């Protein structure tokens, strides 16, 4: 966390700084997207 890295989560991959936030996704919904239709957050595929 808190570093520039290339991450691969489940079937998604990308580069960016990963920081745990207070956002809460619905129970079964892992991947989000912003107003630009680009993922701004991802839920930990393993932990919650």
């Amino acid at each position: 966390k808190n570093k520039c890295v290339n991450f691969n989560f489940n079937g998604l991959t990308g580069t960016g700084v990963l920081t745990e936030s207070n956002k809460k996704f619905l129970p079964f919904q892992q991947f989000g997207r912003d107003i630009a239709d680009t993922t701004d957050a991802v839920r930990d595929p393993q932990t919650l």
Binding site: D34, I35, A36, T38, D40
Partner: peptide, 28 residues
């Protein structure tokens, strides 16, 4: 007269701050 720039600033579009701040403009 009214994040939005948060998403767009990440796409590679950078919003440059104005050389003249709104605080000094009020003093004009």
């Amino acid at each position: 007269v009214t994040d939005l720039i948060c998403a767009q600033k990440f796409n590679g579009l950078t919003v440059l701050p104005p050389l003249l701040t709104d605080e000094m403009i009020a003093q004009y």
